[PDB]
Symmetry: D2
Subunit: 295 residues, 4 copies
């Protein structure tokens, strides 16, 4: 037997950082969960019990906190690139670092219509994520994403004209509920190293904001023919607005809300145009994916 | 052996309702999870296999959907009172109905600064809940609550002057992070029946909004001496603003964020006034409760 | 406003203890999650910012570990009674301690048919729990429970003869699937103090084992007329086998498995006697409770 | 913009099947969660709102139940291969089917030392999984796995001799707790089609049992030098016992249990050889992966 692939590190490292403006007294908080996995010349830890090649996972944990103390933690594309580069520069035998960051929302409170200097609310479990792969001699690959964005529209969704055969019971419809949790990922052009990531720092927050805005507006305004057709419109617009993105990937569950026939009870009308009360289905769910790139 | 207490019914009943304004084209959605448990003269179903006294849990489920079709589902205090009253009026041998409603957020989307007519976002897992106990000859007891409201302040929290003995390691502090998930419950005066609940319908949404606003403003503005002292200030203000509330109960976890001593690494200063990077603790957590009533 | 009720302490305190037999080399592990809440003369911490009455929740955490170091942690009824008694004896102004323990399974591994001296498996998320209330001048109240015991029987469950009215769609059945998660609680006679709890130590593990065995055998062997009727048979037998129990409470969800009509597809027969494939329902669920005590 | 990749289908499809032996009266239950995603000539559903190429996800759901009615559901490698092959044979424009099955434990109850004919218990959240990729003209790729197998050993784990630098605080140890959740995947040789999968049916359950037994025995008996070294020993033995496996992948969290220094309290000794009480850490955790193949 031989080691074909190996990676190891520390997962679920919770980090909070506060920034304190001395002039204004305004405080800004950042909270993330970080995972770092390393690869390189480490096969002998597996095959020969040679721990000399192991950077302890405990040390990786320490490194994350020290890196967050000495560097900006925002945008997360930059922090992830700094953290990944650290490992491949510090350790001769480590050739790749894989950094995953989940950013948690701490939104400044408005009290009596003014922004509060040091109070925050978690407005939704929506996350902003990055995946940074730093590979010796192959630069920095960044995938940025938003996840956990849960939306519903109560009309202006259709689904008709699909394949009908002896397995099909689904009725065509010209008016349904559409609800999903949005997972959207945009993959940047490969960066040569940290200097090039730093040169594009302003684009990261701006592209996240664009991706979010395009997703919400397209969902709200499209007279949707299908999840497939609406999601492609979202992806097309993101690629048009940021030339440094190579691909956009969406993964959307179709969270079903079923009509309830109440006609057995005193002829109560609750289907088609009369539908008011619906049964949200926990499972099963549709799952629709696509990856959109340039011509 | 004897049956001392028995209750049965249906839990986890997901319900969606849409309201469609024909004039404006504006649609409003409501989504809840409902539990109904019944009590009454049902001991023989347990002791003698006498199913004739059982209103099937499946029928309770049907009743929830039929009730939501024929009545307003907001405010939830009213819907719960209608649903509970139905069971004790329809079934001679059922003497109490216990209704629990969890309301899920569907917040109308703003697209290009205008409210969208039929598109919604789940802005946070905060819930609005009711517990309604309808008891034949004892009226309607309503407990209203908000839960899942997660906040953090990065300064203006202290904790000093506590009991110190041979079990104590905790250092006194004049500046810490305070973070909690708020669970707040206000218990209404007993209502004689549905007519009296209907007479107070406007107070329900208004009192929920007051409870929320008082909680957020007090948290943000109090130079907190302890969770105990801040929560009592919240409860005192709610009781002052709504005379029909008898008691206010708060249950607050103290979600700890620990300083990280980095002085072992090149004398890096990250404690006391120099603290920037902290380790959020998943567990354990403080848990602080109190119930506040009138003199 | 006045404080009507207050309690505070530490939740989610994870504890592991190992016992090492020096003679045999056999090691035994215990892992629990502990919550301690205190009550007493503490209102001024809420009303006056008087922290002098607060035993810090951090100190409660330390006390749990010190108590586990110096005492047996099994049976959990005994450990909980020791921990609760500590607080009301050590602190003059603390008059009640509320201890909740969840015990996690670590079952010794069998390797090549022999018990392994120091290796363990988590065989199921079933828990053994205690609730201990130690109240100055009112002794020690213990509720023991098992929870998370998930079972299914594929036949020998019926449900017919229930109330039928204009809300009823459910068909009577003489053969269905019955599946539940068992939550069973037995409440001990009040104990005068720690000496009396110690005098009954052997009864705690024995009664837990009896409750488990009665639950499994009754579920498996009863030709069930309803969840109500089967659960009462369980409770009756536990009360008959342990005279120091006052009450037995069961809380059982009815986790539904629905027949799937496939007759639309090439007349495939999958209902009634021909039913082979079923759709497990995540929600809603029936919820059936009862408390059984002595004549 | 162009569609680079697309797949869609139905997730979270819960299925139960019962087998009834007419001779013995013995019943055997199977419960799984199934996901099917399709790929093929479907880009126009995304780009042109052409639903004619869409096999509705609702129809995929129906197909899963019909397939389970007409075929064995065990071993899951066989059921997954039948289900995937169905789609690429029935639909000219579908060229790949991706089937994921999670099998849930329903273990027959022993009542009074005899196996019960129709009663089952969920003994642990351990799963048996398959991933089946059926690709027109490229055969059937099967990955089998077990997941959710949670173990702990209280001694006979070491970790010393790792890299020490200015980021390192971790002390070397010759005696620690090792606890993990095992995720183990074995990848079969490519199969030409369903006839070849059928020819190897007995190997699937046997290889699952071997993988489980090797994992448990190696964990229990290895005087572990590291997670890395123990996991490689597991992988080496599976590859030696089943020639039709190409690779074995393990993913192991290192769930930390920390010593608690109690020496501040009356000089209590609870570290090194005196350690009895430990604090289980929820996060962070080590994460160690490797893929082992043949020379
Ligand atoms: O088994 C281990 N492997 C590692 O890579 C490691 N790092 N810290 N502790 C560890 N334990
Ligand atoms: O066992 C049962 N008890 C009930 O109360 C019930 N209601 N519907 N189905 C049921 N099954
Ligand atoms: O606000 C607080 N209240 C308490 O009771 C406490 N105990 N430790 N820390 C604490 N913080
Ligand atoms: O938008 C949809 N896409 C699909 O592929 C589908 N299948 N069933 N319903 C559906 N809705
Ligand atoms: Ar969509
Ligand atoms: Ar607070
Ligand atoms: Ar039962
Ligand atoms: Ar291991
Ligand atoms: Na390197
Ligand atoms: Na009545
Ligand atoms: Na006392
Ligand atoms: Na095909």
């Amino acid at each position: 037997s031989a080691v074909k692939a190996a990676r190891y590190g520390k997962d679920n490292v919770r980090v909070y950082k506060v920034h304190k403006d001395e002039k204004t007294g305004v405080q800004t908080v950042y909270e993330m969960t970080v995972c770092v996995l390393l690869e390189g010349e480490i096969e002998t830890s597996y095959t020969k019990a040679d721990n000399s090649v192991i950077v302890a996972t405990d040390s990786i944990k320490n490194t994350i906190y020290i890196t967050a103390k000495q560097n900006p933690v925002t945008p997360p594309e930059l922090f992830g690139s700094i953290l990944g580069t650290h490992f491949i520069e510090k350790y001769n035998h480590i050739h790749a670092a894989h950094v995953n960051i989940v950013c948690h929302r701490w939104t400044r409170m408005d009290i009596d219509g003014k922004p509060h200097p040091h109070s925050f609310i978690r407005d939704s479990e929506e996350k902003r994520n990055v995946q940074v792969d730093v590979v010796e001699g192959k630069g920095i690959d960044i995938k940025s994403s938003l996840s956990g964005l849960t939306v519903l529209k109560s009309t202006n969704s259709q689904f008709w004209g699909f394949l009908r055969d002896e397995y099909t019971t689904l009725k065509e419809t010209w008016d349904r509920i559409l609800s999903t949790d949005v997972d959207a990922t945009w993959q940047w052009k490969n960066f040569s190293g940290l200097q090039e990531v730093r040169s594009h720092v302003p684009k990261f927050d701006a592209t996240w904001a664009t991706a979010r805005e395009v997703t919400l507006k397209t969902f709200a305004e499209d007279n949707s023919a299908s999840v497939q057709a609406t999601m492609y419109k979202m992806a097309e617009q993101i690629l048009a607005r940021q030339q440094l993105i190579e691909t956009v990937e969406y993964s959307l569950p179709n969270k079903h809300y079923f009509e309830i026939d109440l006609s057995w009870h005193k002829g109560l009308q609750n289907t088609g145009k009369n539908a008011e009360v619906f049964a949200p289905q926990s499972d099963p769910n549709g799952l629709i994916k696509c990856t959109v790139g340039r011509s």
